[PDB]
C-alpha cells in the first residue's frame, strides 16, 4: 500500500501584526527584522486556539475532496502549542468535524512535527487498513513567545496547515530520513512543566520560548543542509529532479544558504515568513498551500518535491516525494 | 517487516506516597481509597521529571538486550506530562542515553498513549527501515493533579514502563482497534494554554487534572468493554485463546465489571494500581514489566495477550498479539 498527498489546505487567523505594529511595543523596527530574517508581518489569533485554527484546516480538506468527517481514518495533528495536553489538539478538530470512524492524536516534534506526522500517517496507509486520513500542523505560537524578548517575539507566528494523505496505486513517498539529536535540545525551548505536589522539590523554570539563535542558524545551514543533500543522493532522484524544496520557513538568509550548500538555486526554494513569520510545525504545509493555490503545484503527481522541517529536539526531518 | 516486543521495564520514582499519608493532606482516609478504586499506595515524584523516568526505562532496556544507544532506530514516548513541548520528552531520553542514529518524538493521546505508540512504531517497524526501537510511556500526573480535589488527587500516580521492539520474520501482531471520540473530552481533561499576547483576548480556564468520573466510568464499562469484544471477535484468535487482558490501571472494580462484560475470568485480568494508582499512558507498561519479571509472561513467543488503555480524549486502543 501507498500513500499519496490529495488535497492542501491553510489557515491563518485574521488578525495581521506587522514588523511596524512591533515596532510600537518593544525596540524593534521593520528594516532590522526583514534584513535579518525575511520577517515583514506574521498572524496573530485574537481569539484562536490551535484546534480551532485546524479545524479550518480539516473543514476546507474535506470541502476540497468532497468528503465528510466519517470517511476519515485518522487525525494527526503536529503542534508544541496545543489547546491541552488532554484531549489532546486532534481529538478537539475530530469532535469538530464529526469524524466519529478516526482515531486522533498530537505528535510532539516541534518545527519537524508536519513531516514526522506526515511519515507516520504513511506508515499507517502502508498497513493497508487505513485508507484516509489528515495531518496537520497548527500552532499559536504567539502564546508561546516571550513578549519582551525583541530578539525572539518578532520571528514567530500563528496559523495552520495540513493535508489529506489518501491510499493511491503509486508510490509517492520516494525517501525520507527523520532524525534528532536530543544532546542540542537546549538551544530551543519552551512549555518547560515543573513538579507541582505537596511531595515535590519547589521547581521554577522559564516556560516562555528560548532560543540560541548562533547555534540554530548553525545547525540548519551546515547538518540540516548535508542531511538533505544525503536524503538526495540515497533517493532514486537526482537534485535536478526536484521541481521544489519546501523548507521550514524560519529565516530568509537561512534558504539562501541552505541553497547554496545543498547546490540547488534559490528560485527552486519557495519562501512566505514574509507574511506569516515562521509558524512552526504549520510552516511546510502553509507554503506547500500557497504553492498549490498559486498553480506553482498542480496535485496531479507531475512533479518531485522535498520537504524538510527543522528545529526543537534538536529535530529534522525531509521527505521526497511525487505530488 | 514484522515487530515483536524483545524486552520491557518500569521505573518508578523512589518516594512512595501511601493512602494514609495522603489522610495528612486532604480529609480522605485508606478504607475508603482501597475499596472505590483498589489503590493502597503510588509512587510521587520529589525530583524527577517525566523524562527522568523513561531515562531510566530506556537505560534498563538497553541493558536486558545488551544493546547500546546507538543500536536504536526510534524513541516514541506516550505522555500528557511532558517535561517540555520543546524539545520533546523523547528527545530528552535520546540526550540522555546517547541514541544519535534515533529519530525521536511524543505522541499525546493520554491513557492510551502506550498503545498508540505501540501500533506506531508497529508501522515504523513494518516498513523494513528500523530494526530497533523504544516505546515508552511515562507520566508525572503529580504535577497535573488538583491536591485540593480529594476525589481526583487520590487516583494517579507517577511512573514510567516501556519496551523495546525489534524486527521479526515472525508475525507477533495479531489485532488492532485504535479510536477516538472527542466530542466527549471535556470529561478528562489536563493542561489547558490560553492565548497570551499583547494582541490576543483571553478568558484563562482551569489547567489541573479534572474528570467526570461516572462518565469515564460508564466510558469503560460500556464503550470500551464492547470495542475490546469486537477487537477480539474480529481477530483471528478466539477469547480462550488469550492468557492475559492488560488493561489500563484506572479501577479494580472497574477490572472486574469489564472482565465479566468482555466474558473472561478476573484471573486473567492482572492488577496493579494496589501500588502504583492509575500512570495513564505508563499503566500498561509497567504492568507489562511486572508480569515479566514475576515469570507471568516469559517473552518467549509462547503467550497470545491483548492489551486495552482507555482515557482522555476520549481515546481507546487494543491491541492484540504473541508475545
Ligand atoms: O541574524 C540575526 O540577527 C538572527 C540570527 C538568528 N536567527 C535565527 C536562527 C534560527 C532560527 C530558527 C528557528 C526555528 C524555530 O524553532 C527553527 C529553525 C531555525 Cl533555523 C531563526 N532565526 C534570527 C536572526
Ligand atoms: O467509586 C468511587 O467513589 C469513584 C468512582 C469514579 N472513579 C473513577 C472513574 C474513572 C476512572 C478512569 C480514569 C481514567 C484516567 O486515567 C481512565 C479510565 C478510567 Cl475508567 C477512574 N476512577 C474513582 C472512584
Ligand atoms: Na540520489
Ligand atoms: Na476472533
Redesign the interface.
Same mark, same amino acid.
Do not use: C
Given at each position: 500500500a501507498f500513500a499519496k498527498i490529495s488535497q492542501v489546505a491553510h489557515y491563518v487567523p485574521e488578525?495581521v501584526?506587522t514588523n511596524h505594529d512591533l515596532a510600537q /511595543?518593544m525596540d524593534t523596527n521593520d528594516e532590522w527584522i526583514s534584513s535579518r530574517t525575511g520577517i515583514r508581518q506574521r498572524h /496573530?489569533? *485574537? +481569539?484562536?486556539?490551535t484546534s480551532d485554527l485546524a479545524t479550518e484546516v480539516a473543514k476546507k480538506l474535506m470541502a476540497k475532496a468532497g468528503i465528510t468527517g466519517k470517511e476519515l481514518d485518522?487525525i494527526i495533528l503536529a503542534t /508544541?502549542?496545543?489547546?491541552?495536553?488532554? %484531549?489532546? +489538539?486532534?481529538? *478537539?478538530?475530530?469532535? =469538530?468535524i464529526?469524524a466519529?470512524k478516526? &482515531?486522533?492524536?498530537?505528535?510532539?516534534?516541534?518545527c519537524s !512535527?508536519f513531516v514526522?506526522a506526515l511519515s +507516520?500517517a504513511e506508515?499507517?496507509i502502508?498497513?493497508g487498513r487505513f485508507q484516509k486520513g489528515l495531518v496537520i500542523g497548527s500552532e499559536?505560537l504567539?502564546?508561546?513567545?516571550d513578549?519582551s524578548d525583541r530578539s525572539t517575539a518578532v520571528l514567530f507566528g500563528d496559523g495552520a496547515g495540513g493535508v489529506l494523505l489518501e491510499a493511491s496505486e503509486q508510490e509517492h513517498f520516494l525517501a525520507?530520513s527523520? =532524525?534528532?539529536? #536530543?544532546?542540542r535540545?537546549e538551544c530551543? +525551548?519552551? !512549555?518547560?512543566? !515543573?513538579?507541582?505536589? %505537596? &511531595?515535590?522539590?519547589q521547581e521554577s523554570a522559564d516556560?516562555f520560548?528560548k532560543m540560541d539563535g548562533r547555534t540554530v542558524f548553525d545547525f540548519a545551514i551546515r547538518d540540516v543542509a548535508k542531511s538533505i543533500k544525503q536524503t538526495i543522493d540515497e533517493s532514486p532522484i537526482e537534485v535536478t529532479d526536484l521541481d521544489y524544496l519546501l523548507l521550514h520557513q524560519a529565516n530568509d538568509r537561512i534558504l539562501d544558504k541552505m541553497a547554496r550548500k545543498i547546490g540547488v538555486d534559490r528560485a527552486k526554494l519557495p519562501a512566505n515568513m514574509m507574511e506569516y513569520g515562521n509558524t512552526s510545525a504549520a510552516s511546510i504545509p502553509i507554503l506547500l498551500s500557497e504553492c498549490v493555490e498559486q498553480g506553482l503545484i498542480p496535485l496531479d503527481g507531475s512533479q518531485t518535491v522535498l520537504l524538510s522541517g527543522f528545529? #526543537?529536539?534538536?529535530?529534522w #526531518?525531509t521527505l521526497i516525494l511525487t505530488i
Open positions: 488578525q501584526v /511595543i /496573530i489569533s *485574537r +481569539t484562536e486556539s485518522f /508544541i502549542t496545543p489547546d491541552s495536553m488532554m %484531549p489532546s +489538539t486532534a481529538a *478537539r478538530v475530530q469532535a =469538530n464529526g466519529n478516526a &482515531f486522533a492524536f498530537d505528535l510532539t516534534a516541534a !512535527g514526522f +507516520t506508515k499507517f502502508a498497513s499559536t504567539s502564546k508561546a513567545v513578549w525520507e527523520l =532524525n534528532s539529536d #536530543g544532546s535540545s530551543l +525551548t519552551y !512549555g518547560h512543566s !515543573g513538579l507541582h505536589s %505537596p &511531595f515535590s522539590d516556560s520560548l528545529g #526543537g529536539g534538536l529535530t #526531518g
